[PDB]
Amino acid sequence: DAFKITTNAKAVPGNYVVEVNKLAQAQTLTTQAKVSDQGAKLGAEGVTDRSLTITAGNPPKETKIPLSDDQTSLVELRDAINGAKAGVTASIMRVGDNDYQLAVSSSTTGENNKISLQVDNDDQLGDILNYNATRGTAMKQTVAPQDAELTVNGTAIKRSTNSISDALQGVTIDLKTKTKTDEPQHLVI
Amino acid sequence: DAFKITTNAKAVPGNYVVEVNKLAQAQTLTTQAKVSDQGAKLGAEGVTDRSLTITAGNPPKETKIPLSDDQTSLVELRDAINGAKAGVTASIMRVGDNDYQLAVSSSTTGENNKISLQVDNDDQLGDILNYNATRGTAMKQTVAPQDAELTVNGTAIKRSTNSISDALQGVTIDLKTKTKTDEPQHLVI
Amino acid sequence: DAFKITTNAKAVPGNYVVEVNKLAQAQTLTTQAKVSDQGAKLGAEGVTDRSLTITAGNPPKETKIPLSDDQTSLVELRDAINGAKAGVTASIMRVGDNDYQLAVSSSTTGENNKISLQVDNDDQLGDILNYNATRGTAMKQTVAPQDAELTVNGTAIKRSTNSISDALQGVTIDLKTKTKTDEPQHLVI
Amino acid sequence: DAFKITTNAKAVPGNYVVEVNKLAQAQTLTTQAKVSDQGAKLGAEGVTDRSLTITAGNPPKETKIPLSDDQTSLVELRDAINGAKAGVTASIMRVGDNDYQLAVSSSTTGENNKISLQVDNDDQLGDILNYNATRGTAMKQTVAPQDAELTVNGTAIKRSTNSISDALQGVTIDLKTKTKTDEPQHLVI
Ligand SMILES: [Zn+2]
Ligand SMILES: [Zn+2]
Ligand SMILES: [Zn+2]
Ligand SMILES: [Zn+2]
Ligand SMILES: [Zn+2]
Ligand SMILES: [Zn+2]
Ligand SMILES: [Zn+2]
Ligand SMILES: [Zn+2]
Ligand SMILES: [Zn+2]
Ligand SMILES: [Zn+2]
Ligand SMILES: [Zn+2]
Ligand SMILES: [Zn+2]
C-alpha cells in the first residue's frame, strides 16, 4: 500500500514494521521570465560562441553544448537539453494562454543530485536559464532534491533512490508513498 | 490514486511530483421554499406571458423559455429546464416525506461558470426560482463554482475542468481527487 | 470509494458533490456482569413464570418470550433471543478465558430504532439483562443508534439506513464510509 | 480494508462496528556497535567455552548454543541464531557502506513475548549482544512488543496475535491495519 516488496532466496522470514518517512525526489528548476510564445527566440542576436553548461549527477558530470540563435526558443532549448543526455530532462509547461515555462529536472533522485546551469556568451539568455548557489525572475528551484528516508524494524535507512535493494538481505522495497504519522505498515515475510 | 494520467508520443519521460489542491466544481442552486408535493403547481393562476430566463456558461448564453401554468410544478419545471439545453441541469431532491427541493446545477465546471435565473411575469414563482447577485427562502447557492488548482513539478496550474490536457506536453491529467496536505503524489513517466 | 452508486433510467446526468457525514448504526447493548462459563445458568432456581420482553423496531414491536431455568445461561439466552425473531440479534463475545459477554444488537439501523429489555419474575437475571431509560454492572449501551447523514450537492439528507434510495431521482447510494473533513467526493453521472 | 473477516457456520448475522486500535507486534532488538565488515569476527580470540543464551516466547523457553570463534561475525551469528529454532529470527541490515547491524526479532507477537540475550565467557561479544532489564552502544530495543487491541460492537478485546479467532462465535478477524480515529469500520455479516 505504501510500498511494494519483492523477495529473493536470501530473505529471512519474520515480522517487520516499516515506516516510510520521505521519498527520494529529483531537483527541478523552472524559468520565471514571462514567455508568451514557446517558439519565440529568447537569446541575443548574432552570437556565434554561445553555449550552455549543465552540471548534473552523482558524481557530477559537466556537459557543455553549443546553441545557435535558432536554438534559444523554449521549444528548441528543451530539444537541445534533452538531446544532450546530460543527466537532466526538460519540458515545457503551459501555465496558460501566452504563458510558458521551461522545467529542467534532474534525471536521478537524491539529496546530493543537484543541477547547475551556466550560459556562456549570452547574458540575456543567462538571465533566464542560469542557476547556481546564489539568486536575485531568474531560474528557480521548484522541487527540492531529497533522499528516501525509511525505517525497517526501528532502524533508519537513507537512500538516494526509491528502489531500496541494498539494505535488507534478499529484499527490495520499491517505495510508492509515505506511511501515516503514528502508523508503520506491519508486514510479514 | 488522486488522478489518472494518459500519455501521448510528445511526453518527455522523467520524474514528476503532483499536488492536486482543488477540483473544478459546478455551481449549484437549490430551492428553499417548502414544497410538499412535487406535482403541486407553485406559480400564480392564469398568467399567459410567464417565462424563465437562464444565464449559464462561459461565455455566457441567455435562454428564455415560456412556462404555461401546468409547467410551474417542480416536476414540470425540472422537465422544462432540462428540455431547454440551456447549459444547466435540474433535478429534484426528496429531503423527506412531503419535503422537496429543486436543484439547478451548471453543466460546466469553472470559477467563472455561474448561473442566474429570472422569472418574468410571475413574482410568486420568482420568489422561489430567481437567483442573481443580490439576495430566507429564496433560491440559494449550495455548491460554489471553482477551477481546478493543481501543481506540476512545483508550478501552479489553474483550469476550469478536471480534465487538464492543455498544460504538459503530451499528457492529460484527469483529476479524481485532492492529494494529502504535506504529500504530493510522486509519479514516473 | 466512500459509497457505491447504482443508477436507473430516471437519473439526470450531471456533476454531483457528495459528503457522507455519518453512517446509520444499530444500537447495541452488552452485559457487564462477570460471567466465566457461557453454559452456566445465571437465573434464579425454580421460577416457572419467567419471561423476557424485548422492544425493538420502528415502529416498535414488543415480544414476550418465556424462559425455562435451563434457558438462563448466556448460550441459551442468545439462542432464545435469536429464535424469537424479535427485531434484535444476540451474540456472545469471549473477552478472554473465563470472561464472556452477551451482546444484543438492533436488527435495524436508525436514531429511532432503540431496544429495551425487561425480565419478568426473575430479579437476579434482570440485574444482568434489563435495559430501559435509566441505569445504576447492568446491561449497557456500547453502540449508539444513529441515522445516516449525507449531503448531495450541498443539501443535507438524513435517513435510518445506509442504503439511501428515496432521495435522488433514479439513484441509489449505498454508503460504505465517511468522506474526509474538507473533501466531498466529486462524482459524475 | 483494515482487516479481513473469514466466517464459519456458527456466526450470527447482524450489524457490527469494529475499531482496530493496536496491532500485535514482535519485539525487536538491534546491535548498536559500529560494525563495518559483516564477515569480521567481533568476539575475543581463543575462547573455547563461549555460548549465547536466548530467552524467547510465552511461556518462555531458554536456549543455550555454543559459538566457536569463527561464529562471532555478524553473518555467522545470524546463521547460528536462526539455526537454533530458539523462538527468534535474526537478520542483518546494511545501513550503508561499511555500516551493518544485526536485528533479533521475536518469532511471536505479544506484549508478553519479550527476548533476552546473554553471552557467557565473552565480555566483548557480550557488549554487543547482551540484552536484559538493565541497560550507549549496547543491544537496543527498536520495536516494542504489543498485543492487538480491537473493539467489536463497543467491547474491547486484547490478544497477542493479529489473527483473532477466539473472540466472536464463528468469526476470525485477521488484522491488517488500524482504523481511523473517529471512524470504526461498519461491517455486515
Ligand atoms: Zn544521500
Ligand atoms: Zn542581465
Ligand atoms: Zn474539493
Ligand atoms: Zn414577492
Ligand atoms: Zn478560470
Ligand atoms: Zn513525499
Ligand atoms: Zn431518523
Ligand atoms: Zn437485584
Ligand atoms: Zn500499529
Ligand atoms: Zn565490557
Ligand atoms: Zn497479552
Ligand atoms: Zn462511522
TrEMBL record, chains B, D:
Organism in which the protein naturally occurs: Serratia marcescens
Protein purpose: Required for morphogenesis and for the elongation of the flagellar filament by facilitating polymerization of the flagellin monomers at the tip of growing filament. Forms a capping structure, which prevents flagellin subunits (transported through the central channel of the flagellum) from leaking out without polymerization at the distal end.
Entry similarity comment: Belongs to the FliD family.
Residues reported in the UniProt entry to bind Zn(2+) 2: 147
Binding sites annotated in the UniProt record for Zn(2+) 3: 186
Subunit structure and binding partners: Homopentamer.
Protein name: Flagellar hook-associated protein 2
Residues involved in Zn(2+) 1 binding: 127
Compartments reported by the entry: Secreted; Bacterial flagellum
